[PDB]
With several copies, the nearest count.
Chain A
Amino acid sequence: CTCVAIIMVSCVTSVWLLCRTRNLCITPYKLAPNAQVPILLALLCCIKPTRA
């Protein structure tokens, strides 16, 4: 019961910092939809594909 608490806390903390990294991927680029997008930051580091 102590071992499943470590595997639950560290799971929801590592994906919490990953969700912050996912969120900060976009707000440089959702603010200017006319700007072009590199192919490295589209699918490798972040999730958003090319749209519009």
Chain B
Amino acid sequence: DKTFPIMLNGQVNGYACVVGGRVFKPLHVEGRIDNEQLAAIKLKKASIYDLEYGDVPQCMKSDTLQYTSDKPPGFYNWHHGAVQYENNRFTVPRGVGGKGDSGRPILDNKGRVVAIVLGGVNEGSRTALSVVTWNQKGVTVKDTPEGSEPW
């Protein structure tokens, strides 16, 4: 796949994903993308959806395909495991869910990204993810649990 990291003071604190048409980078992290083809892109602020400008050149457009509605509870892959739930994400166990991780795509079995992880460090017995999601008819929402500290 393709997900270039964001580095502030040398170390890695976040990752920026590229969806088809627009590159999505969280703004609760700060730093600079190490790609010279991506650092020249203008930064456009938004709400906590964390938009950025889709000034991707025509040579390498459409990196990943997003996934619309009709989403089963199913089994969905994840960079450090798997999440099996639709309304929120699966309460993944401890260990996974550290720091410097927010920005990972959550893909289906076909490789279609359905979410972008932002928060939910610790949620009791198992940590619950705070992701952005597309609703029942394709509008982007933000889903959070109560008392979820960001990354």
Contacts and interface: CB of A to CB of B under 8 A. Distances in A.
B151 to A, nearest CB: 22
Interface string B115-151: 0000000000000000000100111100000000000
Contacts of B66: 32, 34
A22 to B, nearest CB: 13
Contact of B49 (A28, A33, A36): A28
Interface string A15-45: 0000000001011111111111000000000
Q: Size range of the interface on B?
A: 10 to 19
A42 B96 CA distance: 42
Given A34-B66, A35-B134, A28 B140 contact: yes
A31 B138 CA distance: 9
Interface string B22-35: 10000000000000
13 contacts: A26-B51, A27-B46, A27-B47, A27-B49, A27-B140, A28-B49, A28-B139, A28-B140, A29-B139, A31-B51, A31-B140, A34-B68, A36-B137
A32 B139 CA distance: 7
Interface string B58-84: 000000001010000000000000000
Interface of B: 21-22, 46-47, 49-51, 66, 68, 134, 137-140
B21 A33 contact: yes
A28 B50 CA distance: 10
A50 B63 CA distance: 25
Given A31-B49, A34-B68, A35-B139, 8 more contacts: A26-B51, A27-B49, A28-B140, A29-B139, A30-B51, A31-B50, A33-B21, A36-B138
A21 B32 CA distance: 31
